[PDB]
Design a protein around this ligand. Structure first.
Ligand SMILES: [Cl-]
Ligand SMILES: [Cl-]
Ligand SMILES: [Cl-]
Ligand SMILES: [K+]
Length: 255
């Protein structure tokens, strides 16, 4: 096992350009390597993972081979397996904004591609349905995104039913013995006692150890979403575009 600094324990695909430079500095001291110019790998972690070992050797004649192998060992290190459950409003009210919801999910799916990530897509209006059962298969995730794009919104906003399906999957996955995240996308416009249903189901989610995020669409009800999510800090606007980097970092910081 490699004992990395705490702030470098994230999977390297998430490393910034500054993280790469910090990794080099750490490796130099840890392995008594010859000094590494700080811009020897001027790129982020996604880019670093595309280089070949030959590329490492050319960039660092004195240490490139060791650095490449160190990266391979780091990639092999055990990390927190995250299950991400997207619970998506497809009620009639979002008929003209289904595109925002789909593309938001697509952008997060394209980010969370490290092998330890598994994704599930749930939609809800009057009833909830699993479009994509929890999986890490990037192929199945591609098809689930194809299916999501085709959804025709209609019906009520029974978000408690969508959360219920996420919780049922979580329970089957191990409950407290998992690292589960729920990402609910909705305007938060809940009728009748649905606010009570939804808040009860979300506390079940947390009872199972999951962390709940709410992503607001349209003129969304900020207060209602704060009561469903773990905290105000886990409510994000889909219109934030920065909002994507915010929720990604928040999720990665749960590990
Ligand atoms: Cl960067
Ligand atoms: Cl060198
Ligand atoms: Cl699978
Ligand atoms: K994908």
């Amino acid at each position: 096992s490699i004992a990395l600094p705490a702030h470098l324990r994230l999977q390297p695909i998430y490393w910034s350009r500054d993280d790469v430079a910090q990794w080099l500095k750490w490796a130099e001291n840890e392995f008594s390597l010859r000094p590494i110019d700080s811009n020897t790998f001027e790129m982020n972690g996604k880019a670093l993972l595309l280089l070949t070992k030959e590329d490492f050797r050319y960039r660092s004649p004195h240490s490139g081979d060791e650095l490449y192998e160190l990266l391979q060992h780091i990639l092999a290190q055990a990390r927190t397996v995250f299950d991400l459950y997207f619970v998506l409003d497809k009620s009639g009210s979002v008929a003209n904004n289904w595109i925002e919801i789909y593309n938001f999910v697509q952008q997060l799916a394209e980010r969370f591609v490290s092998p330890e990530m598994r994704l599930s897509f749930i939609v809800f209006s009057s009833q909830a349905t699993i479009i994509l059962p929890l999986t890490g298969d990037r192929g199945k995730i591609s098809k689930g995104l194809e299916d999501l794009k085709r959804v025709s919104p209609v019906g009520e906003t029974y978000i408690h039913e969508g959360l219920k399906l996420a919780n049922e999957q979580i329970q089957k996955a191990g409950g407290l013995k998992t690292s589960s995240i729920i990402i609910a996308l909705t305007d938060g416009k809940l009728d009748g006692l649905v606010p009570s249903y939804a808040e009860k189901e979300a506390k079940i989610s947390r009872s199972l150890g999951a962390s709940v995020y709410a992503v607001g669409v349209l003129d969304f009800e900020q207060a209602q979403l704060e009561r469903i999510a773990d905290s105000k800090e886990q409510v994000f606007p889909v219109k934030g575009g920065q909002a994507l980097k915010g929720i990604i970092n928040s999720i990665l910081a749960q590990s």
